[PDB]
Here is the input.
Amino acid sequence: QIQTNYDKVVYKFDDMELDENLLRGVFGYGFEEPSAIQQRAIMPIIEGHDVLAQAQSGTGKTGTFSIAALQRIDTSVKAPQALMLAPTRELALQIQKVVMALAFHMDIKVHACIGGTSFVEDAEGLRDAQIVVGTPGRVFDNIQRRRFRTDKIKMFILDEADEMLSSGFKEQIYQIFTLLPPTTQVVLLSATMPNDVLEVTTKFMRNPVRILVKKDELTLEGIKQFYVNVEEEEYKYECLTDLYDSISVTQAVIFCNTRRKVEELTTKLRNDKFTVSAIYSDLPQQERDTIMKEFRSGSSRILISTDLLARGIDVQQVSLVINYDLPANKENYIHRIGRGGKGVAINFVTNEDVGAMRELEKFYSTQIEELPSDIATLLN
Amino acid sequence: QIQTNYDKVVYKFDDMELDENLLRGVFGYGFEEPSAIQQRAIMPIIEGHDVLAQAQSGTGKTGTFSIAALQRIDTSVKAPQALMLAPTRELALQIQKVVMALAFHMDIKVHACIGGTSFVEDAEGLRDAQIVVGTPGRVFDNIQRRRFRTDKIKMFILDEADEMLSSGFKEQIYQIFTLLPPTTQVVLLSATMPNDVLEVTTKFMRNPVRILVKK
Here is the structure.
């Protein structure tokens, strides 16, 4: 979801105190209701804060800094007031179209400082322009050659910071900062939040409002890696049946590599009264949440599912997770036993899954001990 | 200044519909905005017209047929598709240098069929070259001895035609035309338009677009 230190949302462009002309342009362009990032990032930008926003490429994001920037432009001033940087000529040109359209009912000049341009037209455009958009290299060159005066600049937008940095624009971006008024508001939009952006964020921004995407991490520390060698694929079921004698409730989830296995296991288990909840990557939306509600409530201590749902499966209050089938792809091991924030994971390997479980210890660095006869302990 | 029968001008390279990599190559090379001849000559060449253009020596003229020729190349075909001729080895090498730069973000092979070159490497170079550039004699010789296959050639550029003719390459240039597939697009750049040039134009070009200088 969204993690932010601003906590203030506006749900409609009408409630943003937008100049009437800009607002006509917002609706005229096709914007109806603010998107998730627009409901949070526009106001803080308008208000003058330095803002760091994690936003995927798209018209929603472009609208965000475009709308805000147009709202802070002093039409009376016929000099650059806002500078927007992009990774490529094309992206810059697209941004210039968006702002232009948004300003369809206003009279603000927007210059594209990009490759392929007679410096005579470039000088002329950068003189009277109120919003300048271009690529780092070209922008820096024009600032150094005095063709682009930056004293009236009040806002600095860094679109796709990650891409710009990874494209090799770090030096020029850093140099642009020192060539812009020290008080300039800094706004940075980025799909990812790598150290490169964090570095810029920390060196150039001031107590910025941060609007980030939640996500989470791996983690195999809240869980204990225990395995059992059934030797033959055929002896797994009985080994799993014996486990349910020294566990005492706890409720567990069991993952299989194939859908059929999930059913056979479910069948064999139900043929013995074992009330198990089975879920496959195909049940309609209305049926999947029905089985989950039955598990996260209606008794049902066991929950069997395939490896494909591991990512979407919200391992509820489970103190035990069983791997009937050792994951096919090492990467999906944690998706099955991750937990982002007690924890026991038991693996059922045969006389073939050998060295295969070691890869899950090479792909990682955690220890997968053997399961001792004493189980009533391993589960609190 | 210019007298043309094509009159259709383009002022920016963005408006020319160039493959993205080639365009990256154009700006990458230092080209900013199309010069007078580039504004008129590139598009007709790309479009397929036999073109006769009065242009003085220069990176502007070179860029003109180089950019067009690069847009027309078919990446999948690994055989000579364009043949460019210049009056001297030096001039040819310069041209190879210009198209190579222009093709920096592309994967095009450019072979120079010029003087002093092991008939072995010359052979290997022409086998999979997509753009071949060189002097009339060396090219004619390589076509006869069969080291240079021409069946895939779609464009024939004659740079500084007046100079090549004034240097005595007339016979060879004429022979090459007959050794190239009949439909090959013909492009001829020349500072002056003497009868030698007019004769070539009338004998080998088909209802060509003509881009000339006032006079």
